[PDB]
């Protein structure tokens, strides 16, 4: 599968680009080009190309516009001191896009094609990757949408894979500042036999009211409890959660297990490995509101943090729910939270040794 | 709101339009024009217009293409013998679109604008409405999508309301035909507090795998059981369900109650009323697989049918699930089922008295 290149004749001026990179925000600006791959039952994935970033055309009756058959991924590209451009565990996103595709009846995109699309876009828009050593990065958003016409409800037979990139700074408006959370009493993220394990747009549209309610209760973010017993803590928005018991080299790390409806975070997977590398004991189990509030107040649970690609790690300092409210430790970012954040971002930036071979070159 | 008209300079030739109407199928072909209304915060709904049916444009980062914030509706336009074009309970669709919008954090569209969009489209594509005297019609698909660019997860501030029409022939070409159902053991349609009560794309994409499995088990359609106890019957695909007990004028109808997570079918609402008009007793309550199989076998439940806008009423003659398999009566369309379908389609076609004022003129 080969990509053809159609250069953007009217890209952003170097001044504009530089301006963006010095103050990108998140998912606000986009690079000059994008990747496009079409899919039909008879030709499979074809017509792969790098074209100028621009409006996309869809028939008014396109499936994605009526029955929400779409999926997406999210990863980053970093610039290193040696001039190379790399990504953090690209293969993991490639494999997850496939699992998401299967759950949504979307044809899988070969992993080598996935990786290739990344190299192709970086080849033409490398100048959009922020300078080395900094905290900035180039967010990559690969996604697939159903584009076949027809108002009948069924899997689409035509799809379009798109890859766009957006300069990225801090995801949350508070940066590293800790966030307060509202445990949703009225809504659930997903339930068994659903789409909670897939990165599917439908999951997000359904969470909008629950997040507005969190803010109306005086909190920054909503946290989800299992849809069955409405007791076990699972995720903050679309981020995984970790609980630190104790501190120092003897501290214990607890995080909800992959129920089957829980999003299998790449960052989550990485942090469990990093914690073990540091000698910390890790534990994947269920944990409810009572244990959380009780042990937090007791002082056993010394920290809590959320993790995901965009924000990496976000400290959680305050909790509010239908039957209570409490603070985690002194309300400040915890030692372990910041050590692990520092360790992971260091590996991604090329500062620390990548013993697991997580960093892949894209150049 | 005033609508501007930009006539299609390249409409379908009479030869093509006529060949379409002779064999339209469903959701396969579209009329010459479509309605479009834009939304922005500072101007609310504006720029209402009737334009040529054609491809839509969206930024690659448009929210609808990433976080599935979209909703839709389905209704019809019929041609009566007196030459007028009418619609069945359009106000109900207008009110449900607003209800679906609230659940998905989308600005509500005034009922007056919704109805006017319908009149406007018919004013120009009236020639696409099938002739009177038959069961054919013009299917109307009003829908709203989030068009604002930006990869941050949150409710969009820009939307586009579209209205398209597709010729619909007689649903049951060679006589009505009953379907076999597979009760999904592995999948769930929606969860409590979820988006199960709104016509929202996400619900449909998440159901594709379950429908494929139903077919793989040798059945026509998948039927959903509640997400909590996995035992109470909810719907068949995107259609509601009814259970007929007994026969003749003393027959009784039972249908799952609106648990708040069930789709408030308009056809469903109408049938309960018509059942009352005919003298049938009606019930809105829970009914599980055990009761269904036990009473269907004992000959107490004599019929089962599904209902929705497209097909109106579809008979269900065979059931298969994880713990059993059984047939309903003689496996043929039931008396009450056909009587109620004849009555409703009769009102919609203008053959029977519309004592409830359900039919609205669009002309």
UniProtKB/Swiss-Prot annotation, chains A, B:
It catalyses: L-isoleucine + 2-oxoglutarate = (S)-3-methyl-2-oxopentanoate + L-glutamate; L-valine + 2-oxoglutarate = 3-methyl-2-oxobutanoate + L-glutamate; L-leucine + 2-oxoglutarate = 4-methyl-2-oxopentanoate + L-glutamate. Gene3D superfamilies: 3.30.470.10, D-amino Acid Aminotransferase, subunit A, domain 2. Pathway: Amino-acid biosynthesis; L-isoleucine biosynthesis; L-isoleucine from 2-oxobutanoate: step 4/4; Amino-acid biosynthesis; L-leucine biosynthesis; L-leucine from 3-methyl-2-oxobutanoate: step 4/4; Amino-acid biosynthesis; L-valine biosynthesis; L-valine from pyruvate: step 4/4. InterPro entries: Aminotrans_IV, Aminotrans_IV_CS, Aminotransferase-like, B_amino_transII, BCAT-like_C, BCAT-like_N, BCAT_family. It holds the Pfam family Aminotran_4. Inhibited by ammonium sulfate at millimolar concentrations and by O-benzylhydroxylamine (Obe). Its EC number is 2.6.1.42. Pyridoxal 5'-phosphate binds at residues 96, 204, 266-267, 309. Its cofactor is pyridoxal 5'-phosphate. GO terms for molecular function: branched-chain-amino-acid transaminase activity; L-isoleucine-2-oxoglutarate transaminase activity; L-leucine-2-oxoglutarate transaminase activity; L-valine-2-oxoglutarate transaminase activity; pyridoxal phosphate binding. The modification N6-(pyridoxal phosphate)lysine is found at residue 199. The keyword Metal-binding does not apply. Keywords: Amino-acid biosynthesis, Aminotransferase, Branched-chain amino acid biosynthesis, Isopeptide bond, Pyridoxal phosphate, Transferase, Ubl conjugation. There is a cross-link at residue 294 (Isoglutamyl lysine isopeptide (Lys-Gln) (interchain with Q-Cter in protein Pup)). One of its GO terms (biological process) is protein-pyridoxal-5-phosphate linkage via peptidyl-N6-pyridoxal phosphate-L-lysine. Catalyzes the reversible transfers of an amino group from glutamate to the alpha-ketoacid of the respective amino acid in the final step in the biosynthesis of branchedchain amino acids. The amino acids can be ranked in the following order with respect to their efficiency as amino donor: Leu > Ile > Val. Belongs to the class-IV pyridoxal-phosphate-dependent aminotransferase family. Homodimer. This is Branched-chain-amino-acid aminotransferase. It comes from Mycolicibacterium smegmatis (strain ATCC 700084 / mc(2)155) (Mycobacterium smegmatis). The gene is ilvE.
